[PDB]
Design a binder for this molecule. Structure first.
Ligand SMILES: Cc1cc2nc3c(=O)[nH]c(=O)nc-3n(C[C@H](O)[C@H](O)[C@H](O)COP(=O)(O)O)c2cc1C
Ligand SMILES: O=C(O)c1cc(=O)[nH]c(=O)[nH]1
Length: 359
């Protein structure tokens, strides 16, 4: 069952008993991305550590970054169980958590905690922190709820991710329209424009940098081409930092086996690879690679990753892999990714970005 596989791995992570990394990762993997130094391009995807529980553990376990939940502002319970199925036969997961956070009241000090204690012991080669934020199912003006995730938990972020594509929350995937998208992105970056004083990183608004998280938008793979062109023609113009370029898909492709394949939810995993990998490409090269890209959806192998890294992502989030291959999907993908850099010719990762569109 994925539900408690997700939860015991999170528990074993929370007290930290899971196996750690060691070899200190070769610098070929170093990826600078609009001023954020990521050690590893592999990270954890925006659904595993929901309520900011144990980011730094999974981090020390070989992910160069994690991305905390989606944090709504008021606590939610989401949808009744059973809400998330394995589709074993084609390495896939339908899910329908319909958001289910503890809230910005609860996670604010959980980051305050992680923000202070991340600098101290082990003298870290800082593993990067992404904060993912969203709306209470039935919120009136969604422009009002994104505004709180910034005001609250956004100063703790190495990168804030406005979630606008969970197929399971009440008309949330419909916010990605030129007029709505632009409003939410502006309103968010109006809030990051709350820069304030001190004595007038450990102390201060602390993020492997002065502050002001590199902002991000999460979009569904189920976009039109009509509208990917809008979304893009917005992003450059809004000066959006980057796009996390794959939530789950609502789609249910033919050639799918495990009998649960008909279930209402967000399909993740293998059949989100081709889906997702093409929808990186159309955003890197519909934005001159100017708008940074972190991609997820079916990334389970260095070859999967490099394949997609080339395509235009400077980083790679994992979850459905992480349930099948285990927690060592981080180090196993790192290793395969590295070998594919030597064999190919251009070592490193930064070099390989945009290589499908390189002039
Ligand atoms: C059980 C589950 C919960 C998820 N929760 C979230 C979430 O809260 N916020 C979010 O932005 N994405 C969420 N996602 C989407 C994943 O973060 C990821 O983008 C998607 O699964 C595709 O990646 P993968 O197929 O490589 O795991 C979730 C996915 C799954 C399977
Ligand atoms: O609410 C959910 O269940 C959900 C959110 C999300 O962002 N992605 C997903 O697959 N499910």
């Amino acid at each position: 069952d994925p539900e408690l596989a997700h939860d015991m791995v999170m528990w074993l992570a929370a007290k930290g008993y899971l196996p750690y990394d060691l070899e200190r990762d070769d610098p070929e993997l170093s990826v600078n991305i609009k001023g954020l130094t990521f050690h590893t391009p592999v990270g954890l995807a925006a659904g595993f550590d929901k309520n900011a529980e144990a980011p730094l553990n999974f981090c020390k376990m070989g992910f160069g970054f994690v991305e905390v939940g989606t944090i709504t502002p008021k606590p939610q319970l989401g949808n009744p169980k059973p809400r998330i199925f394995r589709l074993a036969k084609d390495h896939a997961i339908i899910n329908r958590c319909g958001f289910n956070s503890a809230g910005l009241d609860v996670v604010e000090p959980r980051l305050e905690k992680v923000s202070r204690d991340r600098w101290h012991d082990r003298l870290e080669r800082h593993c990067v922190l992404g904060v993912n934020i969203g709306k209470n199912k039935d919120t009136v003006n969604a422009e009002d709820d994104i505004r709180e995730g910034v005001k609250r938990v956004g100063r703790f972020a190495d990168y804030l991710v406005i979630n606008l594509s969970s197929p399971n929350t009440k008309g949330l995937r419909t916010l990605q329209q030129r007029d709505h998208l632009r409003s939410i992105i502006t309103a968010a970056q109006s809030e990051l424009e709350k820069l304030e004083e001190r004595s007038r990183a450990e102390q201060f608004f602390p993020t492997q940098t002065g502050k002001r998280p590199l902002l991000f938008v999460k979009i569904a793979p189920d976009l039109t081409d009509e509208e990917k062109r809008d979304i893009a023609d917005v992003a450059l113009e809004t000066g959006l930092d980057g796009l996390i370029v794959t939530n789950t898909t609502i789609q249910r492709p033919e050639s799918l086996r495990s009998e649960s394949k008909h279930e209402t939810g967000g399909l993740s995993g293998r059949p989100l690879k081709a889906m997702s990998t093409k929808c990186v490409s159309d955003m890197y090269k519909m934005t001159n690679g100017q708008v940074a890209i972190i991609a997820s959806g079916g990334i389970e192998t260095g070859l999967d990753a490099y394949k997609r890294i080339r395509a235009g992502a400077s980083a790679v989030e994992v979850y459905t892999s992480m349930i099948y291959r285990g927690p060592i999907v981080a180090r196993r993908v790192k290793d395969e990714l590295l070998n594919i850099l030597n064999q190919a010719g251009i070592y490193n990762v930064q070099d390989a970005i945009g290589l499908d569109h390189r002039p």
